[PDB]
Amino acid sequence: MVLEATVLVIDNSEYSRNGDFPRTRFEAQIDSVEFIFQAKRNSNPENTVGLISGAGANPRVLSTFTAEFGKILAGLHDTQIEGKLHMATALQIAQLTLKHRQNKVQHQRIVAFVCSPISDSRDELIRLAKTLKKNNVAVDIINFGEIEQNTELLDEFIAAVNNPQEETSHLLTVTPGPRLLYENIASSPIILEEGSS
Amino acid sequence: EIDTILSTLRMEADPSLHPLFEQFEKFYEEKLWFQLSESLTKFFDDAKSTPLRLRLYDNFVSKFYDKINQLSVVKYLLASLKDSKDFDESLKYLDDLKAQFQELDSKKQRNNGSKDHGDGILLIDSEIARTYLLKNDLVKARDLLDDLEKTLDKKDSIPLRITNSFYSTNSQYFKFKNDFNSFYYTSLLYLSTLEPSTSITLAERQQLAYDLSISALLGDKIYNFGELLHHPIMETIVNDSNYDWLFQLLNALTVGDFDKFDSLIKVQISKIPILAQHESFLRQKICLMTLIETVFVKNIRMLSFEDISKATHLPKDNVEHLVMRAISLGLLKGSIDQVNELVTISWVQPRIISGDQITKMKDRLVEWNDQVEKLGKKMEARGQSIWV
Amino acid sequence: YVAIEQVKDDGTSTEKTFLHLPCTIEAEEAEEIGVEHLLRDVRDQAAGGLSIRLTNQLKSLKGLQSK
Numbered sequence: 220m221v222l223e224a225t226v227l228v229i230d231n232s233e234y235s236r237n238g239d240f241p242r243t244r245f246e247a248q249i250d251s252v253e254f255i256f257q258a259k260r261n262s263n264p265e266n267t268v269g270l271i272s273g274a275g276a277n278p279r280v281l282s283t284f285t286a287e288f289g290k291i292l293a294g295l296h297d298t299q300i301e302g303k304l305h306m307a308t309a310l311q312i313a314q315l316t317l318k319h320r321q322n323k324v325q326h327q328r329i330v331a332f333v334c335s336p337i338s339d340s341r342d343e344l345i346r347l348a349k350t351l352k353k354n355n356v357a358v359d360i361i362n363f364g365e366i367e368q369n370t371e372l373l374d375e376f377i378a379a380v381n382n383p384q385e386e387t388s389h390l391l392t393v394t395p396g397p398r399l400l401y402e403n404i405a406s407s408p409i410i411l412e413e414g415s416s
Numbered sequence: 417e418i419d420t421i422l423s424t425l426r427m428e429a430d431p432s433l434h435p436l437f438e439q440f441e442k443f444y445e446e447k448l449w450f451q452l453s454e455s456l457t458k459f460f461d462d463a464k465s466t467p468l469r470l471r472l473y474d475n476f477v478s479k480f481y482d483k484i485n486q487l488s489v490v491k492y493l494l495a496s497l498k499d500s501k502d503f504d505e506s507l508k509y510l511d512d513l514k515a516q517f518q519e520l521d522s523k524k525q526r527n528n529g530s531k532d533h534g535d536g537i538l539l540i541d542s543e544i545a546r547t548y549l550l551k552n553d554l555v556k557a558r559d560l561l562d563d564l565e566k567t568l569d570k571k572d573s574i575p576l577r578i579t580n581s582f583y584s585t586n587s588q589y590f591k592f593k594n595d596f597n598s599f600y601y602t603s604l605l606y607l608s609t610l611e612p613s614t615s616i617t618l619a620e621r622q623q624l625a626y627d628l629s630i631s632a633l634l635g636d637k638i639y640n641f642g643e644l645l646h647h648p649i650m651e652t653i654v655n656d657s658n659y660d661w662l663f664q665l666l667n668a669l670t671v672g673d674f675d676k677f678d679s680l681i682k683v684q685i686s687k688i689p690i691l692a693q694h695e696s697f698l699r700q701k702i703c704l705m706t707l708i709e710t711v712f713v714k715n716i717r718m719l720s721f722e723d724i725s726k727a728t729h730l731p732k733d734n735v736e737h738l739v740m741r742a743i744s745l746g747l748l749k750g751s752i753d754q755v756n757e758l759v760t761i762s763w764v765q766p767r768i769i770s771g772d773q774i775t776k777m778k779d780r781l782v783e784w785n786d787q788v789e790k791l792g793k794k795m796e797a798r799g800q801s802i803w804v
Numbered sequence: 805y806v807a808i809e810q811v812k813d814d815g816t817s818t819e820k821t822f823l824h825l826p827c828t829i830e831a832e833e834a835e836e837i838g839v840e841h842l843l844r845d846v847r848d849q850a851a852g853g854l855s856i857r858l859t860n861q862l863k864s865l866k867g868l869q870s871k
Contacts, residue, residue: 236528238447238483246527297529301485367448397447573809576818608813647815785869792865803862804855 220410221263222324223386224284226316227252228309228331230273231300234364235334240400245300247400248332252295254401255330255409256288262410267321270294273309273331274302284321307339310347314356326385326414327356333373334364341372348379355384359412361404363393386414418444421475425468433463440472444480453484456492461614464495477513482520487577489513490536491613494543498615506547514540538564538574539581546585549592561586577611596631600638603628607647621649622658629662630690633669634697636704637745641670642768672706674729703728703738708747712767713776718760 229252231245240247252270259266267284270291281294313329337344351358358380362373373390380388389412393403419441426437439455456476463469473496481489493513497506514537521533545560564582568574583606590599603624610616628649632638644650654663661684668677685692710727711719721739725732739759742748749763767773805822812819831839849860 233485234448234450236483237449243449243527295529299530300528301531368451573818579811579818604813605811608815609811609818643814651815788865788869792862792869795865796862799858802855803859 220259220266222265222322222326223259223263223328224267224269224317224320224325225259225328225330226269226271226313227255228271228273228313228329229295229298230304230332230334230364231298231302232274232304232335232364233301234367235300237334237367239395239397241397244334244400249292249295250401251332251404253288253292254405256291258410260286260288265321265325267325269316271309271313271316272298272302273304273306274299276303276305278309278312280316284319304333304335304338306337307343307347310344310351310358314351314354317356326416327354328386329356329358330409331358331360333360333362336365336367336369337372341375344376345379348376352380352382352384355386357384357386357388357414359389359391361391361393361407363395363400363403366392367395383415385416386412418475418479421471425472429466429468433466433468436463440476449483452480453488456484457488460492460495464499469496469499474509477509478516481516482524486517486520486533486536490539494539495615497543503547503551507544510540510544510547535575535578538567538578542581542585546588549585549589552592554589554592557585557589561589576609577613580606580609580611583609591627591631596634597638600628600631600635600640603631604640604643604647607649610648618653621653622656625649626658626662629666633665633701634694636697636701637747639705639765639768641666642770669702669705672702672709674702674706677702700738703730704742704747707738707742708765709767711748711761712764713773715780717762717764718758721757721759724759 229248231248235243235245235248237244256268259268264286267286268282268291269280269284270282272279272281281298282291285291314327317327360373360377362371365371365373377388377390389408391407393400393407422437422441426434429437436455436459439451443451443455459472460469473492477489477493490513493509497509500506517533517536524531524533541560541564545557545564548554548557548560561582568579568582583602587599587602587606590602628644632640632644650659650663653659661680664680665677665684668680681691681695681698685695691698706727707724710724711717721732721735724739725735728735728738730738736752736754739748739752743750743752747765748761750759750761752759806825807820808823809818809820812821847856848863850856
């Protein structure tokens with residue numbers, strides 16, 4: 220997609236191994252990550268992608284901004300599944316990752332895969348949501364881990380973010396039952412999403 | 417097939433234990449491998465008491481292992497052979513599991529990309545060692561522990577549960593050989609680092625607490641009472657029947673009163689056959705304790721024998737000999753003069769930390785601090801002009 | 805400080821901590837000749853003459869007292 224930098228947050232909580240998507244969900248997500256990266260590159264070469272973790276206590280930068288599927292996949296090929304989501308910590312860090320950029324005209328977008336319910340106070344994430352939006356960071360949730368075993372509390376947060384921004388936040392709902400994770404994401408807006416720009 | 421096994425388990429189970437069984441069938445089906453592990457975990461912790469475990473574990477361990485964390489697989493097997501009073505059975509199931517992990521890692525390592533499987537290795541070997549100790553094949557056990565120790569040091573860090581299981585096996589071997597000092601020392605390490613698993617119950621504290629207390633009572637050098645209290649084992653429970661008499665021995669030592677100590681021990685000599693035969697040790701221990709303490713609190717580092725005679729409640733003939741032994745052990749060091757009937761110490765073991773003693777420390781360093789102050793100001797004035 | 809991993813034995817879990825290692829300065833020969841040449845000061849303590857170590861005696865006391 221034109222002039223856009225999107226950090227993918229991969230979250231490999233302990234609900235990543237759940238075999239709901241064949242063979243396992245973890246391996247389903249590699250296919251998903253390869254899917255998004257090639258599509259956005261071919262469409263626009265100025266699209267760039269970095270890879271960070273949502274898992275572990277403190278996030279890890281595996282990759283910087285790149286138009287290289289090799290660079291992303293090398294870091295992805297070895298990763299832990301016993302880390303755990305800490306969404307609140309992750310949100311503030313993603314912004315910091317985003318300051319360095321191929322060029323500044325590129326937008327600020329996070330796409331985050333979600334494999335587990337929130338692990339943080341609900342009230343805090345609302346406050347963080349509104350800090351992101353001043354600087355025009357919009358956050359698109361591919362949701363499927365929250366609605367496994369908890370109620371959907373994400374809707375509140377997506378509403379809070381949504382303001383005139385470089386891109387808007389989106390709630391795209393993907394059923395956790397078998398359907399193959401990459402396949403839902405190909406049918407969902409990922410490049411049919413839009414902003415207020 | 418598996419469903420038939422689940423139905424048998426439910427029929428024998430209590431209505432209250434029905435929902436745990438029903439959760440295994442649905443979650444497996446739903447391919448929620450997170451809940452598949454959670455439901456199971458609850459079951460093994462407490463329903464290990466019941467024979468329910470035999471049919472559910474072995475089948476699930478031999479079938480659907482791959483899905484859940486490996487750690488969770490070996491945790492259930494541990495629970496099953498706890499209550500098992502058969503050693504043929506125990507040895508069989510271990511050798512079998514070990515073979516299964518070996519296969520498993522060929523796929524799993526690449527699939528996740530990262531996922532340890534060395535956790536299960538060590539625990540298996542720790543269990544096998546122990547099996548041999550109870551079978552009283554002590555020699556096999558010895559060399560397996562040694563090997564684990566070497567392996568372990570190559571790793572920088574392991575889980576709490578891994579070092580707690582190493583320690584547990586080692587502590588068992590030591591009380592078997594009746595190496596009392598080494599049993600107790602390794603038992604301390606066990607308590608600190610303890611598994612977050614809640615297999616350890618109040619009854620399991622009590623079992624461990626009788627041995628720990630016995631080892632230290634018969635000692636003449638074990639003075640880790642302050643650490644003992646603070647450790648979970650005695651922290652939560654003191655108000656059982658085992659901890660009525662046994663804890664009073666313990667208190668009696670600490671206050672250094674021999675009159676009380678004498679009273680309790682006579683009754684305990686009929687009741688306890690360990691204390692019946694180790695009478696000599698119990699009295700020696702209390703003597704050395706009051707003596708090492710009395711010199712410590714005093715800033716004076718020599719005290720006559722005759723005052724020590726009062727302090728330990730033993731005649732002066734016996735005190736002179738005891739003090740010769742104090743040097744040998746190296747609990748005290750000094751010199752012995754019988755041209756004034758004095759003991760002049762030059763070295764005293766650090767005593768246990770107590771609010772009272774700290775208070776003495778605070779004074780001492782305040783006092784010294786005033787000398788320093790007085791001197792530096794006087795020293796400034798003299799030769800004011802030359803400090804180039 | 806060096807990160808070490810050891811059981812803090814008190815009824816507390818494995819603790820990770822930063823244990824003090826004394827450190828000293830050292831200079832490569834190649835740097836050092838140039839360090840000395842840059843410097844030319846009379847020093848708070850050089851272990852020089854009587855008056856210089858004498859200053860250090862006043863300093864050393866006040867050192868201990870704070871300490």
